Nucleic acid binder design. Structure first.
Ligand code: NA
Ligand code: NA
Length: 325
DNA sequence: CCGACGGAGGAGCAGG
DNA sequence: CCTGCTCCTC
DNA sequence: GTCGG
């Protein structure tokens, strides 16, 4: 199970409410931040005062923990769950393309279920229809061995379009995770820099649709594709679940800052650019830049690999498998 | 107290 | 044609 | 909702 999972489930459920119903994004991250640090906490919380010591748990969450520990539930949560409007709004946001704004409008005009969504196709946009059509699959995890094939098809199909493309599958997968939520692909080409072939991403997408790897399109422009993919059925067995795949085209001079940022983790990203500051550097997802007598960032530094970023700030290179914080 | 909390590409709209 | 807005995504 | 300044 998990030492404190009853508490972290309570917080995560509260986070979804603030995000989906209240439209309080910062409260959503507050509950998420508290849920994270408590999931890492290697003891089993016996009081709200104990949890309040941790960074991210404050007065209000400590009192809710005192109540959950004493009675086994949270009344704020109990009243929210039996409120039919709040929870229907919550549920509809699980459809890709339906955020908190669209979810409330739907529930306002009597639309509360997937069945209601299917009876009202006229009121959905293209993204929302694809999210509805694949509602079940998109909530399924991707086992690592399925990522490996998907990765193999992607890089192989990419190389066939041009040997000069470079593609890196990032996310938790690159750190060696047993499963992935989606597939996130970072693409670049030497002919695309910041001081700068006009269909570089389209040609790679075209090829993936042609071998019927990419099945649908959620959004697509010159630098960012968000769509749907599916592995080919072995022909002995049942077909695979449709999966989400994003493909970003990044200038070559910003590629490995991107690969590093979208590899993560978000904690490691936080710590890495923390260290960078103590050494006189600033890193975002695009560049690493020097500071800066008064604190002004200078011109981007040349980066040919991930290790160049580690070397500038004088950090020992760390494998993606060792970058979970 | 009191402001910050990641933030930009693309879809879909308004409007110049 | 263009910019600029919310919304959604990650 | 929480934190740091
Ligand atoms: Na605290
Ligand atoms: Na959604």
């Amino acid at each position: 199970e998990t030492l404190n999972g009853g508490i972290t489930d309570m917080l995560t459920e509260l986070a979804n409410f603030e995000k989906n119903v209240s439209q309080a994004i910062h409260k959503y991250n507050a509950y998420r931040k508290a849920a994270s640090v408590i999931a890492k906490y290697p003891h089993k919380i016996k009081s709200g005062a104990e949890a309040k010591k941790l960074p991210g748990v404050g007065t209000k969450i400590a009192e809710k923990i005192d109540e959950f520990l004493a009675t086994g539930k949270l009344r704020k949560l109990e009243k929210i769950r039996q409120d039919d409007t709040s929870s229907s709004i919550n549920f509809l946001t699980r459809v890709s393309g339906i955020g908190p704004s669209a979810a409330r409008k739907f529930v306002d005009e009597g639309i509360k279920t997937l069945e209601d969504l299917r009876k009202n196709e006229d009121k959905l946009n293209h993204h929302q229809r694809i999210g509805l059509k694949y509602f079940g699959d998109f909530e399924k995890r991707i086992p690592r061995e399925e990522m490996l094939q998907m990765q193999d098809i992607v890089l192989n199909e990419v190389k066939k379009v041009d040997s000069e493309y470079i593609a890196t599958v990032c996310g938790s997968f690159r750190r060696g995770a047993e499963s992935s939520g989606d597939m996130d692909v970072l693409l670049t080409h030497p002919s695309f820099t910041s001081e700068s072939q006009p269909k570089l991403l389209h040609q790679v997408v075209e090829q993936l649709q042609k071998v019927h790897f990419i099945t649908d399109t959620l959004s697509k422009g010159e630098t960012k594709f968000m769509g749907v993919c599916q592995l080919p059925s072995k022909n002995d067995e049942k077909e695979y679940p449709h999966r989400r795949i994003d493909i970003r085209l990044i200038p070559k001079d910003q590629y490995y800052c991107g690969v590093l940022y979208f590899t993560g983790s978000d904690i490691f990203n936080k710590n890495m650019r923390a260290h960078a500051l103590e050494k006189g550097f600033t890193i975002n997802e695009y560049t690493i830049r020097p500071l800066g007598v008064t604190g002004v960032a200078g011109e981007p530094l040349p980066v040919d690999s991930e290790k160049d970023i580690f070397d500038y700030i004088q950090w020992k290179y760390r494998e993606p498998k060792d970058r979970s914080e």
